[PDB]
Design a protein around this ligand. Structure first.
Ligand SMILES: Nc1nc2c(ncn2[C@@H]2O[C@H](COP(=O)(O)OP(=O)(O)OP(=O)(O)O)[C@@H](O)[C@H]2O)c(=O)[nH]1
Ligand SMILES: Nc1ncnc2c1ncn2[C@@H]1O[C@H](COP(=O)(O)OP(=O)(O)CP(=O)(O)O)[C@@H](O)[C@H]1O
Ligand SMILES: Nc1nc2c(ncn2[C@@H]2O[C@H](COP(=O)(O)OP(=O)(O)O)[C@@H](O)[C@H]2O)c(=O)[nH]1
Ligand SMILES: COc1ccc(N(C)c2nc(Cl)nc3ccsc23)cc1
Ligand SMILES: [Ca+2]
Ligand SMILES: [Mg+2]
Ligand SMILES: [Mg+2]
Lengths: 53, 437, 310, 427
């Protein structure tokens, strides 16, 4: 069990111990957000068109 | 000194953010008016606490934070709360219509309307940074804002701050305190879209925090307030290295280096001890060996799961209080003999240890007792994949019937995004499996 | 009223345990995928342990220990015996080796019995080529060249013991064992009663003890069973820290089948541990009723078991 | 997040008036609109249902509609009738004669623009309108025919707002005319397409409760409406008061409705009480829980054991142990798990509010989306066809310009609704 990298300061200390060694773009974002707004607008236009019948 | 900006998104993120910033002020001696008597660097300084606080010419220490919600109710309490003078009004961003527990409403419908404003308010804080390290992002998996708006913001932060680390503190959904039946959907949707944009994410399962509050604090039915004070203690343990002098986890880059050797497996398990009720008149103070041993008890983990049946890829112990390295190594040696701690064979079997001599701070009138020494263990163990398994299962039950999918499609999302997000999660569970057997 | 689900329909043992649970009027069976169960009689492979103990309002119990496969697969058991200091590299396990079809150069140090098993053979090559013609992993192990042989018949046998480990990690040895008798010679060397003196090729302990007093001058208890209890206790104590559910959010119990071979010095050896065993038809009723009393009713509320104390 | 309330026709205005009486009392508003209130929980979300006027008066965001002036005069004569904004009374003179066609196509059409003008004025003063709630019966002409006409027009002008209704289903045991099944079936067809959520308030169940449980020999509409006002108060709790949930109409819709057309709820209430007579022993949380799930407490005459709960919302009112509430709610699900669909995990959500309703220390309100609601629509479908097969009483409708084909489509759509509810009862 090996201790290493010990750093001490007035607030504390840190160290390491080894028990054992090893063995999208702004535009693409804009496109997806606007695609979804078009699907919303389409479906709402279908609703209003059906309410117009 | 390099600055860190905290971003709090949705109800869970905002309310947890308040708990953390209250605790940060107590730890650093910053009063609710933002004054700090011990900062002799008036109007500035490159001190460690300046990573999280800026300073006015008038000596006010102001969190490097922004709170964003798609409805005003929760942030309005920050605007009128104990620490209202702490935050600049531009830092508290509010909508009028929330996400209705709907990821697609947060990410697409309502989010697209407010994302530019949020990024300009973030840009304003970045402009006061001499060297920005990156972001700490707090949110729920289950909320419509926490899930959907957060993932939209994470994508834009990658575009606008390409070189900057992004860490997450994420609330995993639990039926005991959840508010929506579709939380499994929102969780998988936000995990899938966010996975590439996050360097390290600390998951907190509300089920784990709730039981810890019942068992160890004797709270009959914990509230968000009980949970958030406990959560803020864990968050404070994790961020202490950024706010105090020391040589372990001193910047956000070191969190990845020390805890995440493989990028997609970037969800370290947090374990915290000791949690002791303020009501216990007689408490025998726990030694280094006892609090360290408690780090391997599933009952003290932020996510209930069994690390004995996974493998470790990294392990850090963050002590606060009366702790010296010798007691730690003595405690580790005996714990190695008595416990199932299996590392992947391509990582060394070892612990990175940080000790801060200041014992944990407790909110006056809270539920946590003051203790002489405490420890937060952060281990990257494949066992945390149990939580993905649980969530993917619940997702599969509802989605097999397409139950509730029309609420998401009706917001402009496509059905294919559900299965795409669910496929990503399938690859994730497989990654953890290959690394853990 | 307690609830349970059945996810392995091919289990004789827990099919009888289901029948018994229902007949108390206090247990109702839910559907396989209903998660609001108290009891899971789980499937044998890929049992979903990570989904147990997350059901608020339900104490959950399952009839398998996660991680107990390390004891219950041929090549993991050898790995466990040779690498665990508790079971040294150990007087009661036959010498064993793992070999992969795509290292045990002590037969040469034998410089001379050399029977081994997977399957049996006397020449290293005869066996080595048998594992490669199959494809998966096999293990080879010394044959017990002088077993104890029952008279009349000169026969050979193995002893099965059933052991029940409860959620508290009490180790209970069922007092009824069974000897599997035998009447390229697989007919009287591989003792599986699947592979007619006593009914069905099974001698139970009462007859076998009577034999040991008549022929040898001893008892089943002194000459064999002490060794067996010692072996069971050693194996289960060794893996206890890896599999115990004492502080877990769900609890486990499990039934094991330990297979022993007795040699001519009245000396016991461990052959296999079976993690989904079956029972002798004479003993199903009693043993299954025991599983309910000790493992299920103790969680959801004289003895046919010997508690092995640790 | 403001709600706009609309009450239409005789039944709609009578149960509408009771609702405003009851919740005004819970929020500490008197008939003059003044707040003489004890707690401050009473005012925190008061804007969901009330406009504030100068002089700190609270005016309901309510619009009163009828093709006949009589029952709106009685409302204005009524106790809280002075609290409503007088401009929001919109009425004609000719009535609807219990005829869906008159309310929907001929009489109601003449008056519907005036109502939409009042709806618009109330909406333009809203900071963020949630949507609307309509009280009406399905068996008359005005609430049923003109109410569904209003819903259709409100949807055209506010397609992104939520539409919620409290719809009273007709019953032969409490019946005005033989044509109620016709009016109801034409209305359900409208409700299926154009509401996000409707509480099915079954006059059959209200009658059975009064007769059997409350031992009222001859129940009046006053006895029926006491049950209705208690149910309306309970199901609104999480819209009106602050809590761990802070619900609104869209979140209720999202979490209760897995498929758009299956949005018809069985409400339940406990303890069941008759008007005027008070009993002095509060229930135990265990008692509340059992009664609220008992078929004898459902306001829709359906047997829950004949179907499955897709989703359930439960609200407990009064000072009680939330720990005990949680345990009792977990108990009913774990003991009766077969009656909750396995493919919607955790489909039961509970909320608690400290303020109890008037006269009770403790109450439990139940909102169930159950496939057993199909029994309600089957019952109405049988009564419809019994007359429709002989085209009986149709001339009342063809005389207003309606075609038989329209009756065939509405019946066929309601049969499809029954099939869809049956589809998920077996999954
Ligand atoms: N630990 C903790 N979890 C919280 C808190 N507040 C909310 N949550 C969790 O967050 C989940 C819901 O997400 P929220 O953050 O509340 O919703 P939101 O982010 O405001 O998004 P909206 O849908 O628009 O409201 C619930 O399952 C809660 O368990 C909190 O203060 N502390
Ligand atoms: N080392 C050894 N020496 C002598 N006989 C041995 C032996 N190892 C095994 N045998 C005998 O040969 C048989 C080979 O069967 P094996 O042990 O593979 O079956 P099993 O015990 O896995 C079947 P089940 O799971 O039904 O109990 C054993 O049952 C035993 O009778
Ligand atoms: N519960 C209840 N039901 C009512 C009340 N008034 C009318 N109804 C029902 O409504 C139907 C009559 O429709 P009604 O609303 O009076 O006609 P409208 O004036 O055109 O709206 C009958 O079948 C009654 O059962 C009431 O006060 N309470
Ligand atoms: C099935 O899961 C859920 C069902 C319903 C809800 N919501 C939004 C509610 N909204 C209102 Cl207004 N009241 C109540 C009362 C109890 S829940 C609830 C949340 C989750
Ligand atoms: Ca300074
Ligand atoms: Mg919110
Ligand atoms: Mg009438």
């Amino acid at each position: 069990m090996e201790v290493i990298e010990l750093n001490k300061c007035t607030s504390g200390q840190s160290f390491e111990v080894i028990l054992k060694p090893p063995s999208p773009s702004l535009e693409e974002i804009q496109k997806k957000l606007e695609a979804a707004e078009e699907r919303r607008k389409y479906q709402e236009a279908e609703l209003l068109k059906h309410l117009a019948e | 000194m390099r600055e860190c900006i905290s971003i709090h998104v949705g109800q869970a993120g905002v309310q947890i953010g308040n708990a953390c910033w209250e605790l940060y002020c107590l730890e650093h001696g910053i009063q609710p008016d933002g004054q700090m008597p011990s900062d002799k660097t008036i109007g500035g300084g490159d001190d460690s606490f300046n990573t999280f606080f800026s300073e006015t010419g008038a000596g006010k220490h102001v969190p490097r934070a922004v709170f964003v919600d798609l409805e005003p109710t929760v942030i309005d309490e920050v605007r009128t709360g104990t620490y209202r003078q702490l935050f600049h009004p531009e830092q508290l961003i509010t909508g009028k219509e929330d996400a209705a527990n709907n990821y697609a409403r947060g990410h697409y419908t309502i989010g697209k309307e407010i994302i530019d404003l949020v990024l300009d308010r973030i840009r304003k804080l970045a402009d006061q940074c001499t060297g920005l390290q990156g972001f700490l992002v707090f949110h729920s998996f289950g909320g419509g804002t926490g899930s959907g708006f957060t993932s939209l913001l994470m994508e834009r932060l990658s575009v606008d701050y390409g070189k900057k680390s992004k860490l997450e503190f994420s609330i995993y959904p639990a039926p005991q305190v959840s508010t929506a039946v579709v939380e499994p959907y929102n969780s998988i949707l936000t995990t899938h879209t966010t996975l590439e944009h996050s360097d390290c994410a600390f998951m907190v399962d509300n089920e784990a925090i709730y039981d810890i509050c019942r068992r160890n604090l004797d709270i009959e039915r914990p509230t968000y307030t009980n949970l958030n004070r406990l959560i803020s203690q864990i968050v404070s343990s994790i961020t202490a290295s950024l706010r105090f002098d020391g040589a372990l986890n001193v910047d956000l880059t070191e969190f990845q280096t020390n805890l995440v050797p493989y990028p997609r497996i970037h969800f370290p398990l947090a374990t915290y001890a000791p949690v002791i009720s303020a009501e216990k008149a007689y408490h025998e103070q726990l030694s280094v060996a006892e609090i360290t041993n408690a780090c391997f008890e599933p009952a003290n983990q932020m996510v209930k799961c069994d690390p004995r049946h996974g493998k470790y890829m990294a392990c850090c112990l963050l002590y606060r209080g009366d702790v010296v390295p010798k007691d730690v190594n003595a405690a580790i040696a005996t714990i190695k003999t008595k416990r199932s701690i299996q590392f992947v064979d391509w990582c060394p079997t070892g612990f990175k240890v940080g000790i801060n001599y200041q014992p944990p701070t407790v909110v006056p009138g809270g539920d946590l007792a003051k203790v002489q020494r405490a420890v937060c263990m952060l281990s990257n163990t494949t066992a945390i994949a149990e939580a993905w398994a649980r969530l993917d299962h619940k997702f599969d039950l509802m989605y097999a019937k397409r139950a509730f999918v029309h609420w998401y499609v009706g917001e402009g999302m496509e059905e294919g995004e559900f299965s795409e997000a669910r496929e990503d999660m399938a690859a994730l569970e497989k990654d953890y499996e290959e690394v853990g057997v | 009223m307690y609830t349970f689900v059945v996810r392995d329909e091919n289990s004789s043992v827990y099919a009888e345990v289901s029948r018994l649970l229902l007949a108390t009027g206090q247990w109702k069976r839910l559907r396989k995928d209903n998660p609001r169960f108290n009891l899971m009689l789980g499937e044998r492979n890929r049992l979903p342990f990570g989904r147990l103990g997350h059901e608020p309002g339900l104490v959950q119990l399952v009839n398998y220990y996660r991680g107990a496969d390390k004891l219950c697969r041929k090549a993991s058991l050898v790995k466990l015996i040779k690498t665990s200091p508790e079971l040294s590299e150990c007087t009661w396990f036959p010498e064993s080796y793992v070999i992969y079809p795509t290292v045990f150069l002590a037969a040469y140090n034998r410089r001379r019995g050399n029977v081994w098993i997977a399957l049996i053979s006397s020449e290293a090559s005869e066996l080595l080529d048998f594992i490669d013609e199959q494809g998966q992993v096999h293990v080879i192990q010394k044959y017990l060249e002088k077993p104890l042989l029952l008279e009349p018949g000169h026969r050979k046998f193995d002893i099965r013991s059933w052991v029940l480990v409860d959620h508290l990690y009490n180790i209970y040895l069922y007092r009824e064992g069974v000897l599997r008798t035998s009447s390229q010679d697989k007919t009287c060397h591989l003792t599986n009663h699947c592979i007619g003196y006593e009914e069905g090729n099974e001698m139970f302990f009462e007859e076998f003890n009577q034999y040991l007093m008549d022929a040898l001058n001893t008892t089943l208890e002194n000459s064999i069973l002490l060794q067996i209890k010692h072996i069971i206790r050693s194996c289960l104590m060794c893996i206890e820290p890896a599999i115990s559910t004492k502080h877990l959010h769900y609890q486990s119990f499990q039934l094991f089948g330990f297979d022993f071979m007795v040699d001519e010095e009245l000396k016991v050896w461990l052959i296999e541990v079976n993690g989904a065993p079956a029972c002798a038809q004479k003993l199903y009723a009693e043993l299954c009723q025991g599983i309910v009393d000790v493992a299920i009713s103790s969680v959801f509320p004289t003895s046919i078991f010997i508690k092995l104390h640790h | 997040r403001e709600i706009v309330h609309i009450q239409a026709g005789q039944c709609g205005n009578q149960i509408g008036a009771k609702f405003w009486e009851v919740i005004s009392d819970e929020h500490g508003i008197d008939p003059t609109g003044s707040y003489h209130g004890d707690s401050d929980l009473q005012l925190e979300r008061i804007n969901v249902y009330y406009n504030e006027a100068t002089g700190n008066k609270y005016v309901p965001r309510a619009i009163l509609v009828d093709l006949e002036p009589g029952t709106m005069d009685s409302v204005r004569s009524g106790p809280f009738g002075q609290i409503f904004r007088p401009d929001n009374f919109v009425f004609g003179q000719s009535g609807a004669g219990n005829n869906w066609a008159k309310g929907h196509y001929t009489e109601g059409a003449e008056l519907v623009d005036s109502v939409l003008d009042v709806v618009r004025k109330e909406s333009e003063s809203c900071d963020c309108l949630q949507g609307f709630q309509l009280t009406h019966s399905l068996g008359g002409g005005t609430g049923s025919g003109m109410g569904t006409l209003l819903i259709s027009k409100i949807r055209e002008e506010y397609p992104d707002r939520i539409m919620n209704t409290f719809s009273v289903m007709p019953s032969p045991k409490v019946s005005d005319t033989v044509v109620e099944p016709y009016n109801a079936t034409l209305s359900v067809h409208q409700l299926v397409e154009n509401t996000d959520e409707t509480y099915c308030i079954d006059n059959e169940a209200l009658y059975d409760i009064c007769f059997r449980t409350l031992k009222l020999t001859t129940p009046t509409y006053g006895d029926l409406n006491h049950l209705v006002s208690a149910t309306m108060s309970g199901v609104t709790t999480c819209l009106r008061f602050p809590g761990q949930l802070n619900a609104d109409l869209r979140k209720l819709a999202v979490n209760m409705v897995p498929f758009p057309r299956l949005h018809f709820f069985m409400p339940g209430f406990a303890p069941l009480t008759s008007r005027g007579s008070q009993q002095y022993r509060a229930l135990t949380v265990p008692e509340l829980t059992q009664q609220m799930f008992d078929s004898k407490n459902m306001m829709a005459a359906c047997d829950p054991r004949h179907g499955r709960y897709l989703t359930v919302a439960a609200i407990f009112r009064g000072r009680m142990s939330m720990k005990e509430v949680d345990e009792q709610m977990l108990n009913v699900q774990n003991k009766n798990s077969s009656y909750f669909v396995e493919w919607i995990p955790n489909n039961v959500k509970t909320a608690v509010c400290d303020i109890p309703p008037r006269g009770l220390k403790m109450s439990a309100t139940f909102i169930g989306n159950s496939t057993a609601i199909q029994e309600l629509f089957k019952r109405i479908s049988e009564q419809f066809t019994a007359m429709f097969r002989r085209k009986a009483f149709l001339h009342w409708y063809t005389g207003e310009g309606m075609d038989e084909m329209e009756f065939t489509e509405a019946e066929s759509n309601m049969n499809d609704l029954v099939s869809e509810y049956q589809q998920y009862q077996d999954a």
